[PDB]
Amino acid sequence: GLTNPVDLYPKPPFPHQVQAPPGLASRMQPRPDHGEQSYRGRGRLVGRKTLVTGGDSGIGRAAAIAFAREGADVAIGYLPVEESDAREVVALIRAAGRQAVALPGDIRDETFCQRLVARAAEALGGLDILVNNAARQQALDSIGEMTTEHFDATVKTNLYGMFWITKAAIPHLPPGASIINTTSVQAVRASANLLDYATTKAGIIAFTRSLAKQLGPRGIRVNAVAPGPYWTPLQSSGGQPPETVVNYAAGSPYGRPGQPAEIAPLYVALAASETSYANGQVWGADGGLGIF
Amino acid sequence: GLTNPVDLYPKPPFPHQVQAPPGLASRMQPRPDHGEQSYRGRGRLVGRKTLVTGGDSGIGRAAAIAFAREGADVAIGYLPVEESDAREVVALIRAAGRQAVALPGDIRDETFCQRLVARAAEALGGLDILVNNAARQQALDSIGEMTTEHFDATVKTNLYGMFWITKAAIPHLPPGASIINTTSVQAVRASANLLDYATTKAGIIAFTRSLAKQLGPRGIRVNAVAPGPYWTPLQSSGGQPPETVVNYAAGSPYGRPGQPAEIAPLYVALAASETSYANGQVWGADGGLGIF
Amino acid sequence: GLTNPVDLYPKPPFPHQVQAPPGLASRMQPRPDHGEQSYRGRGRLVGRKTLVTGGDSGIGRAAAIAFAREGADVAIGYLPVEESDAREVVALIRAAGRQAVALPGDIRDETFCQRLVARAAEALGGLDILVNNAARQQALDSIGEMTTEHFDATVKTNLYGMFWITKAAIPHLPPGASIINTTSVQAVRASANLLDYATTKAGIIAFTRSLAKQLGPRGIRVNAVAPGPYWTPLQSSGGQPPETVVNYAAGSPYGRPGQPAEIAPLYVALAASETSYANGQVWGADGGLGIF
Amino acid sequence: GLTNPVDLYPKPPFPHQVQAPPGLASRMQPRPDHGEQSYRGRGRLVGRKTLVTGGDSGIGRAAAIAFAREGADVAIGYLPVEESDAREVVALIRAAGRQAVALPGDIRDETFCQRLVARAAEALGGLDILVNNAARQQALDSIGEMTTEHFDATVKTNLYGMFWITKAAIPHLPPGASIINTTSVQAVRASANLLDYATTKAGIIAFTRSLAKQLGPRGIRVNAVAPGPYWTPLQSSGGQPPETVVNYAAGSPYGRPGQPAEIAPLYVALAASETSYANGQVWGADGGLGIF
Numbered sequence A, B, C, D: 001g002l003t004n005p006v007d008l009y010p011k012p013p014f015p016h017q018v019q020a021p022p023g024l025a026s027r028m029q030p031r032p033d034h035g036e037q038s039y040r041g042r043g044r045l046v047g048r049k050t051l052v053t054g055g056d057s058g059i060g061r062a063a064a065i066a067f068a069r070e071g072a073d074v075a076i077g078y079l080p081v082e083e084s085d086a087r088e089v090v091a092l093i094r095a096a097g098r099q100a101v102a103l104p105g106d107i108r109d110e111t112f113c114q115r116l117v118a119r120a121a122e123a124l125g126g127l128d129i130l131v132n133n134a135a136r137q138q139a140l141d142s143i144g145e146m147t148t149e150h151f152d153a154t155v156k157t158n159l160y161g162m163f164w165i166t167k168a169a170i171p172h173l174p175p176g177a178s179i180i181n182t183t184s185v186q187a188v189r190a191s192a193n194l195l196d197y198a199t200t201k202a203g204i205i206a207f208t209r210s211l212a213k214q215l216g217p218r219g220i221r222v223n224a225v226a227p228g229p230y231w232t233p234l235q236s237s238g239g240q241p242p243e244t245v246v247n248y249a250a251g252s253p254y255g256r257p258g259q260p261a262e263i264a265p266l267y268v269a270l271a272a273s274e275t276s277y278a279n280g281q282v283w284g285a286d287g288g289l290g291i292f
């Protein structure tokens, strides 16, 4: 049946709240909806072998839950401090009857990126969906406040980590495989307070489009997803200022931010074998901002 | 299982072939694949009520087949000369166990656009997916060859028809409904020989994004699909020069054009109730050109 | 010397004000600055032969003044009710020592478009800069309020008029000539209240890019300019709602709208013979919105 | 007078030619035209104080020549091996009657970036035009060939160097100053063989747009220039495969690549004080490809 999207999920104002990054979904108010109850699989990805970075919380968690419910085995990356979020996702993947692999570690470390891919492929018996979804986002009002360490941390997480993981993954990927990279509306919106983050998110789009041309001839599709505002720990752990969290997305056409559950369908559609002429695309889901 | 997209469908060279517009799918060599055998529904749109313009052939036919197999009732628009293509789609909708409504007529006629919507809604018992997919595309190498009649025919079909149909449809659309407009990579690629067509396809994107902001607050989502090259009668009936048809998409990353079957998943995903934060988006499927 | 752009021109709030379209610059509060005092020519367009539609006021007036001061002869189009604005521009072109031609008439009339070009070329002794700058902009909050007459008036002014004038002009344009089309940030921003206008402005970009590919081989360059908010009669005569006029561009990085004087340099640079590899471009001047 | 842009400059085929990067303009066949004879200044930047990275050759050299001829003092960065190109630019700046400052060194070195800005500002008596134009571009057909050292060299040159130089420069820039960043059509075209380069060029655009929003309120404008193909040593020293150099831009609307002379007007126009509402823009000059 039909459902009105406007009031399907919570609207601001939200309680004043902050966490140290990367944060925990379980400490947000309200708790985000990653599709734990609502997502019903229909056999769209049976037997696929998936690695999702940042699969413990937020958009990556929603994708991991959906992939498992569609019949795919799922390895998740995350940072060690997020173990309490990650254990929930691992249990949900397993409750869908599929294999879950927990692979915590810092993707700014090149050797860890190599081990992440090797261990995921070994555990799953192969690899044929890669989702580069982990990110650092730390807002700063001025470039004068941005140290080299700040800029480097954002670029190493969001560009180098993706590069190393993707490079390590390609020798495993058979014809028919899919790579999906999470970008952001910030690639275009380029807010004053997200100078380094926006740089990396625009970079991710060109990386996606170039790699799609490179790998298309080998039968591997490479695509990106461009979210607008979603209710995740990235925002309340310093990705946005606190007043922005309280009134998050209040001025958007629905008057509310997205919940991660709502974007999982884009990841399933892009990975599915039937979506065979989608390559090099950036698919947006921004609730009416109309960016991608 | 995994399937290599590169050789899943035919590659050029194709036989020298030309038709008068709008053409018939059954006269193309090879016959296009709209998903007649391959598309399997999974209950994703049960009971939805759909109107697809240009649903007799090509991308619109692939969308109509998929919608019916996902459980939706489907009305199709087309031009009277296309009856032999259209009756096949009516039969496919009925073979999926759903109601089919055949509504031929010329969408450059404002009164016909009003009757099309009124008759579709009356026959289906409502309306909650509208796909503005019909188009005119007639390549010309120079503006000196483009008469006012040429320009007006393209603009009246691709902009005015969409405007009139959409305006008439909105009073029928409940919260939870979806409007999907087919645009083109030509909105950006803007080839020398498609001056009027490219103008209209860029126009369709801004129309989509503006209307998404108007209707989002009312719970209606408005999105666009941007195909790259697909094997359809629009291309061999004057949309492309004949030598381009012979070698169509030969230089693309897969070395082949898309078949309409491959893009149907985008229409299903955009219409599904679960894709509830996709509004004002343009989703491409261009086989690695990397436009949208 | 250096000048701070932030406070170079007036900032809101502006007096409550409205006019019947197309409006008069002389009735705005404050009066707009089209460069009447500030623009100093430097011989950049000596002997060029120009036609500017909407050259009586706003951006077109600023371009006409600059072209004349750079040594070009200038014909201007405008609507008859704007005679009092137009006579000022004609006097300023002539005070720069160049020829001015006043060509009032409605560009929605195909025969007038043909006469406009023929009379401009006859009077000037040729034609080698064409600026399609006239536009209709009438905001409406809902498609339900938008009659066919409303939509048609916007599309006929902004797309058909450009088509007819451009088609009539090309046989006059020698190698080295330039066509410049004014678009808008609305092509991308696509506000809810500018459904028809935004459609046409996106269309203008694809028209520009396609015609550039068509005419590049003949040595004719075709480019577009994408303004952000400028203080012109288009806004207070129904292009924007009244509260928007009072607080116009207050939230932008400078906190003020542009004055037409500020965008004239883009038109001069695009027309100049030295800018010989700019073809098919869209150059923005939006005061930090960062759209084009 | 009018000049036909099509045959104003050389067209392919060009001789088979390759150099080690960064290469020398003097070894290209034919020698590039940076405007040494053609560019005539008109007092548009009198007394400005400029730093151009990569000012020894190519687009940066054309900008440096034009800036000096418009009345600005010019410091140039370059790599020590390019001294024979750089000394010619120093001589051209001095022949225009302005001060030239030669500042060779490697912008991947953060301490050098700080010294570069400090020494330029000290020598010139201030700083008010900064052009981040240096780049690394090394084509590779596959990500398997791209070592971390390759990726890091491109990212450190094109993103970190820009970040460090810009951060060091801002405390010197008074209201009225301009920052201009050279990007590329590759930000959008994203070719298969330019995976790291295209990533950085898209990043540069978002960096530009974000910084424009930060600095606009302080009266500093930040813009980008997006060249299409130009005849420069970056291309024949590994930026393109050798067979592409031989046939460079043969299929474009003019059938020839740009010469650096042709793009200098964009840098002058963006820096000029009169262009006061251009902020956060990307202005293309791609010869009819129609990208930006």
Ligand SMILES: NC(=O)c1ccc[n+]([C@@H]2O[C@H](COP(=O)([O-])OP(=O)(O)OC[C@H]3O[C@@H](n4cnc5c(N)ncnc54)[C@H](O)[C@@H]3O)[C@@H](O)[C@H]2O)c1
Binding pocket: A022, A023, A053, A054, A055, A056, A057, A058, A059, A060, A077, A078, A079, A082, A105, A106, A107, A108, A132, A133, A134, A135, A136, A137, A157, A182, A183, A184, A185, A186, A226, A227, A228, A229, A230, A231, A232, A233, A234, A235
């Ligand atoms: N939430 C939004 O509004 C929004 C908007 C646009 C784009 N995005 C994108 O969505 C993606 C997912 O973020 P999210 O919003 O779901 O938030 P999230 O905090 O739930 O997910 C980000 C994840 O990144 C991972 N991560 C961060 N640094 C890492 C490191 N050094 N090593 C390993 N893993 C690391 C963490 O595991 C974390 O869970 C990101 O790419 C982000 O850019 C989010």
Ligand SMILES: NC(=O)c1ccc[n+]([C@@H]2O[C@H](COP(=O)([O-])OP(=O)(O)OC[C@H]3O[C@@H](n4cnc5c(N)ncnc54)[C@H](O)[C@@H]3O)[C@@H](O)[C@H]2O)c1
Binding pocket: B022, B053, B054, B055, B056, B057, B058, B059, B060, B077, B078, B079, B082, B105, B106, B107, B108, B132, B133, B134, B135, B136, B137, B157, B182, B183, B184, B185, B186, B226, B227, B228, B229, B230, B231, B232, B233, B234, B235
């Ligand atoms: N095939 C491609 O390469 C391609 C590429 C990009 C975009 N598109 C878009 O795909 C959409 C569908 O076209 P297609 O390629 O499937 O070709 P198609 O010929 O199968 O479909 C176009 C349909 O338009 C309908 N139509 C045309 N003029 C009409 C009129 N006056 N009144 C009513 N109906 C009318 C016809 O019924 C026709 O079947 C179009 O919007 C087109 O712009 C196609």
Ligand SMILES: NC(=O)c1ccc[n+]([C@@H]2O[C@H](COP(=O)([O-])OP(=O)(O)OC[C@H]3O[C@@H](n4cnc5c(N)ncnc54)[C@H](O)[C@@H]3O)[C@@H](O)[C@H]2O)c1
Binding pocket: C022, C023, C053, C054, C055, C056, C057, C058, C059, C060, C077, C078, C079, C082, C105, C106, C107, C108, C132, C133, C134, C135, C136, C137, C157, C182, C183, C184, C185, C186, C226, C227, C228, C229, C230, C231, C232, C233, C234, C235
């Ligand atoms: N002012 C802004 O904020 C803004 C922003 C983006 C784009 N633009 C564009 O700038 C261009 C110029 O408008 P402006 O803002 O300088 O306002 P303006 O009112 O000064 O100029 C518009 C002109 O259009 C002409 N015109 C309108 N309908 C016509 C018709 N039927 N026949 C002949 N001429 C007709 C009138 O002569 C009028 O002076 C337009 O193309 C507009 O889309 C303006």
Ligand SMILES: NC(=O)c1ccc[n+]([C@@H]2O[C@H](COP(=O)([O-])OP(=O)(O)OC[C@H]3O[C@@H](n4cnc5c(N)ncnc54)[C@H](O)[C@@H]3O)[C@@H](O)[C@H]2O)c1
Binding pocket: D022, D053, D054, D055, D056, D057, D058, D059, D060, D077, D078, D079, D082, D105, D106, D107, D108, D132, D133, D134, D135, D136, D137, D157, D182, D183, D184, D185, D186, D226, D227, D228, D229, D230, D231, D232, D233, D234, D235
């Ligand atoms: N030529 C083209 O076709 C083309 C196309 C699009 C964009 N671009 C852009 O144009 C800009 C200028 O390049 P060009 O084509 O004029 O070629 P070029 O080789 O003449 O200039 C590039 C310059 O970069 C400098 N450079 C490189 N690495 C450096 C380092 N580590 N430290 C200091 N300086 C360093 C060198 O001094 C060199 O002269 C670049 O940003 C490039 O991305 C060029």
Ligand SMILES: [Mg+2]
Binding pocket: A022, A023, A024, A025, A056, A057, A058, A078, A082, A085, A233
């Ligand atoms: Mg987390």
Ligand SMILES: [Mg+2]
Binding pocket: B022, B023, B024, B025, B056, B057, B058, B078, B082, B085, B233
């Ligand atoms: Mg048909």
Ligand SMILES: [Mg+2]
Binding pocket: C022, C023, C024, C025, C056, C057, C058, C078, C082, C085, C233
């Ligand atoms: Mg006027």
Ligand SMILES: [Mg+2]
Binding pocket: D022, D023, D024, D025, D056, D057, D058, D078, D082, D085, D233
């Ligand atoms: Mg050099």
